[PDB]
Design a protein around this ligand. Structure first.
Ligand SMILES: O=C(N1CCC[C@@H](O)C1)C1(c2ccccc2)CC1
Length: 330
């Protein structure tokens, strides 16, 4: 089997991407944030504290003939940005782009943090990291990909995120028309439950490439590119007027600037992120200070190849017995 679904930016800045997902019988379609950095499929629901729902589409298990309460099971998760949600668990039929999993754990939110309430465009998350990170207790549950894997034509999914444009998540096949040149594959460590890999270095603009190992995660659920402070300083040094602002929470730059590209290594191959992809616009409405898309990972504890990086590439998440990651230009 295979599945193919379009993923759409939630706003003009590509702050996140949403992908329609069918849950239950008859289908209830929710727009979920596919997140390769976590492993819970959770949704706004009829059980979510009413004051914490503001425009989201909710899953109502009592209206689904295939929903079954997973007795005794609860979940609770916190994300890198300090957001969180928690609740109880149903199993139900879940389809993405024509690919159906029966008995998928669908984590129903009783509580969500303010950041989720305030984003009317995201109805939940669909985790695509390794199932070892799944938070369901006392019986850990499998991700949608982990459940679908054995039925797929090939045990893979691909992320093809657009810059200010829709893109695609494919399950079970590699669309050879969706990228240029060849896909370069690179080793993955699953020890922390992430799609963790080691970039071979970087370049800033037309500068010379610096060979250096940068260990990080491929995370579709993180907006920006978070890299070591040395690397980030070298980037922003090439933008007149750019500075790290403690008050704003990272590097900012004059909105009148033309940003240089940033290149990252994947083995001997190179992925080029155009300068425009690094512009996240005014820090507040009407400001001439703009927020940068490349930021320091110093305060995080891990480097994160988020959407800014991934949208520059066609990315293969290969879930074979020994997982790997593949990157191609497009
Ligand atoms: O809605 C979110 N956004 C991310 C920040 C920019 C916003 O436009 C979108 C939040 C989120 C999404 C996915 C994972 C963790 C947190 C904070 C709730």
């Amino acid at each position: 089997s295979t599945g193919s679904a379009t993923t759409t930016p939630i706003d003009s800045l590509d702050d996140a991407y949403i992908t329609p997902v069918q849950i239950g019988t008859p289908a209830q379609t929710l727009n979920l944030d596919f997140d390769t950095g976590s492993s819970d499929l959770w949704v706004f629901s009829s059980e979510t504290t009413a004051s914490e729902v503001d425009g989201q589409t909710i899953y109502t298990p009592s209206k689904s003939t295939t929903a079954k309460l997973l007795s005794g099971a609860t979940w609770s998760i916190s994300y890198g940005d300090g957001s969180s949600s928690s609740g109880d668990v149903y199993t139900d039929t879940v389809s993405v782009g024509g690919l159906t999993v029966t008995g998928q754990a669908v984590e129903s939110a009783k509580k969500v943090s303010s950041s989720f309430t305030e984003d009317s465009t995201i109805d939940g998350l669909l985790g695509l990291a390794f199932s070892t990170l799944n938070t369901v207790s006392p019986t850990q549950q499998k991700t949608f990909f982990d459940n679908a894997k054995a039925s797929l034509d090939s045990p893979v999914f691909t992320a093809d995120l657009g810059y200010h444009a829709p893109g695609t998540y494919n399950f079970g096949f590699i669309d050879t028309t969706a990228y240029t040149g060849s896909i370069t594959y690179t080793a993955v460590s699953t020890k922390q439950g992430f799609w963790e890999w080691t970039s071979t270095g970087y370049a800033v603009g037309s500068g010379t490439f610096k060979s250096t190992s940068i260990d990080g995660i491929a995370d579709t659920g993180t907006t920006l590119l978070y890299l070591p402070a040395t690397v980030v300083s070298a980037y922003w040094a090439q933008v007149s007027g750019a500075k790290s602002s403690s008050s704003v929470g990272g590097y900012v730059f004059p909105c009148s600037a033309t940003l240089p590209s940033f290149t990252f290594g994947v083995g001997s191959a190179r992925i080029v992120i155009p300068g425009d992809y690094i512009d996240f616009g005014p820090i507040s409405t009407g400001s001439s200070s703009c927020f940068g898309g490349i930021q320091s990972s110093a305060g995080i504890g891990i480097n994160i190849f988020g959407d800014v990086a991934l949208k520059a590439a066609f990315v293969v998440f290969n879930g074979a017995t020994t997982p790997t990651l593949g990157f191609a230009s497009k």
